[PDB]
Amino acid sequence: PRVYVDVREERSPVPSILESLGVQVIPKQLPMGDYLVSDSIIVERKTSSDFAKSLFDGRLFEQASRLAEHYETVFIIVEGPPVPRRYRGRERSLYAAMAALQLDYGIRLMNTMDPKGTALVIESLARLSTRRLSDVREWQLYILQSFPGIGRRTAERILERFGSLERFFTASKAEISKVEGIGEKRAEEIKKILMTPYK
Template sequence: MRIIVDERERGSRVPSHLRALGVRVLFKRLTVGDYILSSDCAVERKTARDFVNSVSSGRIFDQARRLAESYSRPTLIIEGDVRIAISTLRAGLRSFYGALAFLWMAYSVATFFSSSERETAELLYALVKHEQVEVKKRIVIREKPKLETLRERQLFVVQSFPGIGPKLADRLLRRFGSIKRIVNASPIELSLVEGLGRKKGFELVRFFEAKYD
């Protein structure tokens, strides 16, 4: 059995645990998902804290959409102590379960919970065994769907800004009318966008003005 793993997962111990279980790990730069198990199944792995942060920013919903557009069995693994992470959400459990419900109802994302990197590896092992041994599916990397329209490309660019999810990207573009005007806006002007706030406005300007190193 083999799993294609995103290069950014090298920092975790999950790949080494997979190797210990006898799985061949192939690292590649992936645009969709963190672990590719078959032509149908890709897995996004998030720590509990990262998941909560991505719910707040809206990033998880864009990731789920792209995962579902590329694979028929989009899967999410949330790793770590969920209770501590939930306490940082404004609406607590309601926001947490609301996000999970939306991911399932809108994108059919199956969600699993893991307490550690080792447990995540065990879960991935069970999933890849089903896909490649029991069902005998081949492994295929599916690239992110092509952005067809100018609007989609604009939204994609703005969503790449730190802390900006689909909703904020749409609000920014509607308020300023173009990416150029967003980048040239002052922190105060940015902070007037609903849901963005003064702190994030200043963070965006620092990001726009940061020197490339």
Template sequence: MVRIYVDEREKSSGVPEILRGLGVTVIYRRLDVGDYIVSDRTAIERKTADDFIKSLIDGRLFDQCRRLSDVYEKPVLLIEGSLRRALSNSSIRRNAVIGALTTLIVDLDVHVLFTYNAKESAFAIKSIAEKEQRSGRSYVVLHKKPKLSSLREWQLYILQSLPYVGPKVAQRLLETFGSVYRVFTATVPELAKIEGLGEKKAGEVVRIIRAPYTPEKERRSQARSIIDYLLKNEENTSSSQ
């Protein structure tokens, strides 16, 4: 039986009910990240084409996808509906949208999927869930703060909040380094030796641990600057043609 955790704010979309009609067990929760959690490593953010354009303009898109990418190894952005129609009702240009999608795919490692309507979205979500859960990744991690009673449980939980670090990798890290502190001070080459990480993933873990904190207002400003850059680049391209 396929089981999917669904953000309760998705009820009005009609997708969860279609999933139920397809035999999927739908469990509603107030999710902090993503709209559909299908496995410990894969979460899906669903947006209508109109909402995609709006979130691109106001900066929410990059913020949401960055958080999705930080928490889940296989983040998916599902865009439902006609982008062509959504663009016709917006001031943003096609090249800016292409630039934004490129940024999501190349820089944030977000998989982008397009569907025509809610029914197609439900079929796509179910297909992803089936593939993930048949491959042995049937348990779903909501990444919410649990009730922990022992020091060991807290240590494992803290490490599992990092990207690419599930229960097994967290245990290997503690067995290798001996403490959470030692893991946090490890170098990329040291972390890369851990089975399940490798150099690229280790580099991302170290980047997150050592990066200075950016307040929410500043993050939105940075996202907004990306939009401005894409729009300006599009204008320059158009004027040169």
């Protein structure tokens, strides 16, 4: 397991703990990030302090996007407490940032408790590497709104009383017409469209 270290990183305790772990550490530089586990996996290392200062600095997302732009797998390692003593306050700000990075950048947070913690995670990434049905609601509301007289509300309102598309398609003018937003008028047109044979 090789990992590359950017030079401005060479000096933490982490390369030492990494080597001590059987992981070869190579000084490179690196156009981005802190350790390059691979070719797809880059790791930014941050003390929760540095995370914090850098959030309220644009610096966190500046880095973030850029990191996401070039590597398939961006890991931000947060070393020490998710929320340092000094920043408990703008706490919803930090957790928030953590969610957005995770979803919008697909960046991956790990919190380690110290340098060993961080070396540990990087050594692991190292070894590990070198080793919407909910789309259905819409098509239903889509299809239902395809019927004359039916909009989106009436459509959800149909899946309300009926739940299946099938049971509504199997329904009586008798049961259909009552659904608010479908008259008898409309209802008759529907049961009819639904039942007239092809030319």
